């Protein structure tokens, strides 16, 4: 029962549909977005790395890895994970705007462990992780955003990362 009227554009960086687009790394039933290296600063202009997690099976676990503030010297000094309360709070697209929604009301049946490994299931600890339910009734797409563009080192700015999770319906009988 906790949400706010955050408004995000999907990209505060100037790049628009010239995003570098990639799918998740789907091993067995684990679909993984791993922003450890693709967000550290290389080119001087920030660019946008989008990670697309398309799901139409029961019990797909989704793991998203964003690097923490200062886990390496100088490289991720100004990361922003939005939504902060995520995986419990996700973003959905509201007319070319991204606004917070509660994930448990969005997809019923969603399995969220309180500790992702032993550490708490929150981007504070640097990985979030959730398992999609056996029945998903309406097609749902939701967003997680992790941003390294504020970080600057050696006159190079880090990249901006978006996860889009697209769930098609399954389990339905109608």
């Amino acid at each position: 029962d906790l949400s706010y009227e955050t408004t995000e554009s999907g990209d505060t960086a100037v790049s628009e549909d010239s995003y570098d687009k990639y799918a998740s790394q789907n091993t067995n039933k684990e679909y993984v977005c791993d922003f450890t290296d693709q967000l550290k600063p290389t080119e001087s202009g920030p660019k946008v790395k989008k990670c697309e997690v398309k799901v139409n099976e029961p019990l797909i676990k989704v793991k998203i890895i964003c690097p923490l503030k200062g886990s390496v010297e100088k490289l991720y000094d100004n990361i922003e994970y939005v939504p902060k309360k995520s995986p419990y709070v996700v973003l959905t697209k509201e007319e070319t705007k991204l606004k917070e929604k509660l994930l448990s009301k969005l997809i019923y049946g969603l399995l969220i462990s309180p500790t992702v490994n032993e550490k708490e299931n929150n981007f504070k600890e640097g990985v979030i992780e959730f398992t999609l339910p056996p029945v998903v009734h309406k097609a749902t797409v939701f967003y997680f955003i992790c941003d390294n563009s504020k970080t600057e080192d050696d006159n190079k700015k880090g990249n901006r990362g978006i996860v889009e999770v697209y769930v098609e319906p399954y389990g339905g009988s109608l």
Partner: antibody, heavy 118, light 107 residues
Framework: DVQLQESGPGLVNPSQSLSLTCSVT?????????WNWIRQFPGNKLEWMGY???????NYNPFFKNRISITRDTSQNQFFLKLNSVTTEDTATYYC???????????WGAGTTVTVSS | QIVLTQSPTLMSAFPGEKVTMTCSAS?????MYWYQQKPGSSPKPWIY???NLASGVPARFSGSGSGTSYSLTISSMEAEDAATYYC?????????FGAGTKLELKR
């Protein structure tokens, strides 16, 4: 604590329709849960039959083919099972159950034996 | 229709003795659920999410497994634990049940 109940038509003759009522008290049928029907064949397996959600959405067992309805009266906190074209195999002890926390059956009703004979 | 084949069909144990019951899914399921039905009563729910126990269940009870193999182990058989135990999956719709393992007390 939520309490469920099942209504009492004990005998239906075959080629007739079977209707049952699960009555709920203590918790509102339109907040947050999924609302299932489960049969129990005599001393035998369970067949999950169906549910209606808080929203009103239906999801049924595909062994039954366009022959069952699970519906609800929200002002009476009730949900209803409608199995059409019953046979003698359809004789069973019928239960309603609120969903578990995620995808099991936490709270069960008492159950109703329905025997089908001509 | 995921077929859960529960073994043994029947068993008899002394009190104190350790009992393990198995359930064989016909394909890969991510979690198994377990219920106890005493005769003349609801199936109370006993194990959820393969490991977690619903409250109202003693700590001697355990569930375990992966893949196609799941099991329920009681470390201390007691008189109260004598009922029939069902497994249930919901890896994919529809949720199926096993046929049950009937447990007795031996005197």
């Amino acid at each position: 604590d939520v309490q469920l109940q099942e209504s009492g038509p004990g005998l239906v003759n075959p080629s007739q329709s079977l209707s049952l009522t699960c009555s709920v008290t203590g918790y509102s049928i339109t907040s947050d849960y999924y609302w299932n029907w489960i049969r129990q064949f005599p001393g035998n397996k369970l067949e999950w039959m169906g549910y209606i959600t808080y929203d009103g959405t239906n999801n049924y067992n595909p062994f039954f083919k366009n022959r069952i309805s699970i519906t609800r009266d929200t002002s009476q906190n009730q949900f209803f099972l409608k199995l059409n074209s019953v046979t003698t195999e359809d004789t069973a002890t019928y239960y309603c159950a609120r969903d578990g926390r995620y995808w099991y059956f936490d709270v069960w009703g008492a159950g109703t034996t329905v025997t089908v004979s001509s | 229709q995921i077929v859960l084949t529960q073994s043994p069909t029947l068993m008899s144990a002394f009190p104190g003795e350790k009992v393990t019951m198995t359930c064989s899914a016909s394909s890969s399921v991510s979690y198994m659920y377990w219920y106890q039905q005493k005769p003349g009563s609801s199936p109370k729910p006993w194990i959820y999410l393969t490991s977690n126990l619903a409250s109202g269940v003693p700590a001697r009870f355990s569930g375990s497994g992966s893949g196609t193999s799941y099991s329920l182990t009681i470390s201390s058989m007691e008189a109260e634990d004598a009922a029939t135990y069902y497994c249930q999956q919901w890896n994919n719709s529809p949720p199926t049940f096993g046929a049950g393992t009937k447990l007795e007390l031996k005197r």
